[PDB]
DNA sequence: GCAGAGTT
DNA sequence: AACTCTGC
């Protein structure tokens, strides 16, 4: 999910790009969102469903990555931060209800750990390196972008910006939507957004770490952050103070139309929660400096894997592998 | 405060 | 087509 309307606000800075512009670059790829999407499969066959669709999509996307001379570093999620789980609990408390938590995590754990073993097997056969992030994989990609270990990161999760990412390629594994390239420098110089502003935007709009303010979108959020200017987390403190005294027997000394609009919307009794900004500023990553290597694939292991998990014969796997090996010449 | 308008 | 955000 990421941040609610962050991509809408940032889109003025992005640059449309042909997939051949990623040729040659080393890039990290968050895979844990692919497994969380092919968790319970899809019935796309004209009469039935697929067995291991996560492996199938992984294979197709590995083929597309190698077709464009990309050198990917896959990053797997680790544990979930406490705030992520609490927000997934409060977003599950709205289960369409009007007028069993210890057996769901334990099933998700083992099912996703088997998906992990399968995916890592396929990645090893393709000779591409991967890393098990300690908690968050988007922060683990951001720390690689910052340390100049990658030329960017392929992801659609806007929340990576809040972890300090600098270069991002988005809509790459989308067919109809053009690939788009975003640089922190460009939208910093355009929109005046640094990391702290983006974190306050996550406070207002909502993310996996906190639910936002029900009325506000990116426009109202930017109007707020520009109406209470400050450093770091100060703007939200000023906003909370002003809103508490605003909802204190009021009756007006020419409040700006934005402040006429903000007295309406409601706030959580604990807003703001500095643990959110802390979890975005100082997350858990591998500070290690890596030396990544990309091995040559071997078609026999790949064909055995394809036959064991999808039931493909040599001439189908080979047909879907013809262009990849064609490009991998020098 | 209403409906135009962007999104899934 | 509903859901939601926001200029008029």
Author numbering: 1 to 99, 753 to 904, 908 to 986
What does the original paper state about this entry?
Nucleotide excision repair (NER) is an essential pathway to remove bulky lesions affecting one strand of DNA. The XP complementation group G (XPG) endonuclease cleaves the damaged DNA strand on the 3′ side of the lesion coordinated with DNA re-synthesis. Here, we report four crystal structures of the human XPG nuclease domain (XPGn) in the absence and presence of DNA. The overall fold exhibits similarities to other flap endonucleases but XPG harbors a dynamic helical arch that is uniquely oriented and defines a gateway.
To characterize the interaction between XPG and DNA, we obtained crystals of XPGn in complex with a short splayed-arm DNA mimicking the 3′ side of the repair bubble. Crystals of the I422 space group contain one complex in the asymmetric unit, hereafter C1, while those belonging to space group P4212 contain two distinct complexes, termed C2a and C2b. In all cases, the arch helices are fully ordered and adopt the closed state, though α6 in C2b is halfway tilted towards the open state. In both C1 and C2a, DNA binds XPG with the minor groove facing α11 and α12b, while the major groove faces α1. However, the DNA in C2a is tilted by 7° towards α1 and away from α12b, relative to C1. Furthermore, the DNA in C2b binds XPG in the opposite orientation, with the major groove facing α11 and α12b, while the minor groove faces α1. As compared to C1, its trajectory is tilted by 15° toward α12b and away from α1. Modeling of an ideal B-DNA on the experimental substrates shows clashes with the α12–α12b loop in the case of C2b or with the β-pin in the case of C2a. Moreover, the α2–α3 loop, which is only partly ordered in one of the six DNA-free molecules, becomes fully ordered in C2b by inserting into the DNA major groove. Besides, the major groove binding mode likely represents a non-productive complex.
